[PDB]
Design an enzyme around this catalytic site. Structure first.
Site, PDB file in Angstrom:
ATOM      1  N   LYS A   1      -2.636   8.227   3.489  1.00 47.79           N
ATOM      2  CA  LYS A   1      -3.618   7.344   2.853  1.00 47.79           C
ATOM      3  C   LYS A   1      -3.092   6.727   1.600  1.00 47.79           C
ATOM      4  O   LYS A   1      -2.245   7.323   0.933  1.00 47.79           O
ATOM      5  CB  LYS A   1      -4.954   8.064   2.582  1.00 47.79           C
TER       6      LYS A   1
ATOM      7  N   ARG B   1      -4.497   4.390  -2.096  1.00 45.00           N
ATOM      8  CA  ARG B   1      -5.622   4.473  -3.052  1.00 45.00           C
ATOM      9  C   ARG B   1      -6.883   4.108  -2.282  1.00 45.00           C
ATOM     10  O   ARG B   1      -7.896   4.797  -2.372  1.00 45.00           O
ATOM     11  CB  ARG B   1      -5.414   3.504  -4.245  1.00 45.00           C
TER      12      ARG B   1
ATOM     13  N   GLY C   1      -7.751   2.627   1.878  1.00 42.92           N
ATOM     14  CA  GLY C   1      -7.088   2.361   3.154  1.00 42.92           C
ATOM     15  C   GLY C   1      -6.263   3.522   3.662  1.00 42.92           C
ATOM     16  O   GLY C   1      -5.527   4.172   2.905  1.00 42.92           O
TER      17      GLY C   1
ATOM     18  N   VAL D   1      -3.332   4.874   6.456  1.00 39.66           N
ATOM     19  CA  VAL D   1      -2.140   4.365   7.132  1.00 39.66           C
ATOM     20  C   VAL D   1      -1.900   5.094   8.453  1.00 39.66           C
ATOM     21  O   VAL D   1      -1.960   6.328   8.532  1.00 39.66           O
ATOM     22  CB  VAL D   1      -0.878   4.435   6.223  1.00 39.66           C
TER      23      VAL D   1
ATOM     24  N   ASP E   1       1.967  -0.051 -10.287  1.00 37.75           N
ATOM     25  CA  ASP E   1       1.737   1.302  -9.814  1.00 37.75           C
ATOM     26  C   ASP E   1       2.980   1.822  -9.108  1.00 37.75           C
ATOM     27  O   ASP E   1       2.884   2.488  -8.067  1.00 37.75           O
ATOM     28  CB  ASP E   1       0.507   1.360  -8.884  1.00 37.75           C
TER      29      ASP E   1
HETATM   30  N1  5L4 Z   1       5.130   1.021   6.171  1.00 40.17           N
HETATM   31  C1  5L4 Z   1       5.054   2.349   6.257  1.00 40.17           C
HETATM   32  N2  5L4 Z   1       5.797   2.955   7.216  1.00 40.17           N
HETATM   33  C2  5L4 Z   1       5.713   4.287   7.332  1.00 40.17           C
HETATM   34  C3  5L4 Z   1       4.908   5.067   6.480  1.00 40.17           C
HETATM   35  C4  5L4 Z   1       4.827   6.551   6.566  1.00 40.17           C
HETATM   36  C5  5L4 Z   1       5.743   7.295   7.311  1.00 40.17           C
HETATM   37  C6  5L4 Z   1       5.715   8.680   7.308  1.00 40.17           C
HETATM   38  C7  5L4 Z   1       4.788   9.375   6.557  1.00 40.17           C
HETATM   39  C8  5L4 Z   1       4.891  10.879   6.395  1.00 40.17           C
HETATM   40  C9  5L4 Z   1       3.949  11.622   7.324  1.00 40.17           C
HETATM   41  O1  5L4 Z   1       4.108  13.035   7.164  1.00 40.17           O
HETATM   42  C10 5L4 Z   1       3.842   8.648   5.852  1.00 40.17           C
HETATM   43  C11 5L4 Z   1       3.850   7.263   5.868  1.00 40.17           C
HETATM   44  N3  5L4 Z   1       4.191   4.476   5.508  1.00 40.17           N
HETATM   45  C12 5L4 Z   1       4.237   3.134   5.383  1.00 40.17           C
HETATM   46  C13 5L4 Z   1       3.362   2.551   4.303  1.00 40.17           C
HETATM   47  O2  5L4 Z   1       3.290   1.344   4.133  1.00 40.17           O
HETATM   48  N4  5L4 Z   1       2.707   3.457   3.558  1.00 40.17           N
HETATM   49  C14 5L4 Z   1       1.889   3.277   2.421  1.00 40.17           C
HETATM   50  C15 5L4 Z   1       1.520   2.038   1.891  1.00 40.17           C
HETATM   51  N5  5L4 Z   1       0.638   1.878   0.899  1.00 40.17           N
HETATM   52  C16 5L4 Z   1       0.085   2.978   0.387  1.00 40.17           C
HETATM   53  C17 5L4 Z   1       0.406   4.258   0.787  1.00 40.17           C
HETATM   54  C18 5L4 Z   1       1.344   4.418   1.806  1.00 40.17           C
HETATM   55  N6  5L4 Z   1       1.855   5.692   2.128  1.00 40.17           N
HETATM   56  C19 5L4 Z   1       3.185   5.987   1.591  1.00 40.17           C
HETATM   57  C20 5L4 Z   1       3.738   7.215   2.262  1.00 40.17           C
HETATM   58  O3  5L4 Z   1       2.852   8.324   2.137  1.00 40.17           O
HETATM   59  C21 5L4 Z   1       1.600   8.025   2.712  1.00 40.17           C
HETATM   60  C22 5L4 Z   1       0.960   6.848   2.034  1.00 40.17           C
END
Ligand code: 5L4
Length: 303
Positions: free
Chosen positions: A17, A19, A21, A23, A137
């Protein structure tokens, strides 16, 4: 229909997640994508992030690749979607918690982060140009690691954009919007002049210095490295308040500790000097992202 649209995407796995939305990993025409989903009452957050990602000339290898903003009506409620490239490793925070890095690995992560921040900060004057953008941020949880071991900056919803032709910021900025732990001294004590766009660039550099400290701790040389920690883990509690941070950063003037071992390796000496030069209380004295990109490029070339 050649462009990516929400009706053609199937969600497969919850990955985290923001702030606002949530993911998800999804599949669009056989390829994996990341989908950040907002509810109807989060339209302002969704729209603002879509607006920043659609900024002219924003695309860069070290900025998360934006695909589309769209709506999806399931027959009961409407979801607001932001679709982007998918990066299996997730955040730099997830990556550094799971792994230690080599000297080469550290330099790749730091240089790519600085390159993405330098592109965000860069202005190209004129209507067919690019406005300078400040993130507001930046942290290890908002930087993603690609398959090639390089970074890309994400979570641009709190960004501010500068219009040089009028010397104005596109929004009326609220004070202290980001993650308290990474707030610059001038943001913590409210001395920041929010009418000067350069103020926001300088605050992003302080945060980037904190992220460089997180990476450097995980750099393993002769099997020697430090365990994963967030900056200020030794001085503030989890979820610190502005007052807790201001007392440490502004009043006591502390910064994350730079171990003596970092002076024994050239790459770590270079990184440590960059950190100190991002951490000055006076934002005007800090390095620019372009200068950091230049120093780290010189180091990557020499290695
Ligand atoms: N484009 C992406 N591709 C892959 C992943 C991803 C891949 C793997 C995992 C670990 C699971 O165990 C989490 C997330 N995240 C994004 C992304 O845009 N995330 C993103 C954008 N804005 C706010 C918060 C975000 N996240 C950052 C990562 O942590 C979660 C929140």
């Amino acid at each position: 229909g050649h462009m990516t649209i929400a009706r053609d995407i199937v969600l497969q796995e919850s990955i985290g997640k923001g702030r606002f939305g949530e993911v998800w990993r999804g599949k669009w025409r056989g390829e994996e994508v990341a989908v950040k989903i907002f509810s109807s009452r989060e339209e302002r957050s969704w729209f603002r992030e879509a607006e920043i990602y659609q900024t002219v000339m924003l695309r860069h290898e070290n900025i998360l690749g934006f695909i589309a903003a769209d709506n999806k009506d399931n027959g009961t409620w409407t979801q607001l979607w932001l679709v982007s490239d998918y990066h299996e490793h997730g955040s730099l925070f997830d990556y550094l918690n799971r792994y230690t890095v080599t000297v080469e690995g550290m330099i790749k992560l730091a240089l790519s982060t600085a390159s993405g921040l330098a592109h965000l900060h860069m202005e190209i004057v004129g209507t067919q140009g690019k406005p300078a953008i400040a993130h507001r941020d930046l942290k290890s949880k908002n930087i993603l690691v690609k398959k090639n071991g390089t970074c890309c900056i994400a979570d641009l919803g709190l960004a501010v954009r500068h219009d040089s032709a009028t010397d104005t910021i596109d929004i009326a900025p609220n004070h202290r919007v980001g993650t308290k732990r990474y707030m610059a001294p001038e943001v913590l004590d409210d001395s920041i002049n929010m009418k000067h766009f350069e103020s926001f660039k300088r605050a992003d550099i302080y945060a980037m210095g904190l992220v460089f400290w997180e990476i450097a701790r995980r750099c393993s040389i002769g099997g020697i490295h430090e365990d994963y920690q967030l900056p200020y883990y030794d001085l503030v509690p989890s979820d610190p308040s502005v007052e807790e941070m201001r007392k440490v950063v502004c009043e006591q003037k502390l910064r994350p500790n730079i171990p003596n071992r970092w002076q024994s390796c050239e790459a770590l000496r270079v990184m440590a000097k960059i950190m100190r030069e991002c951490w000055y209380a006076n934002g005007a004295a800090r390095l620019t992202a372009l200068r950091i990109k230049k120093t780290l490029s010189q180091l990557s070339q020499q290695e």
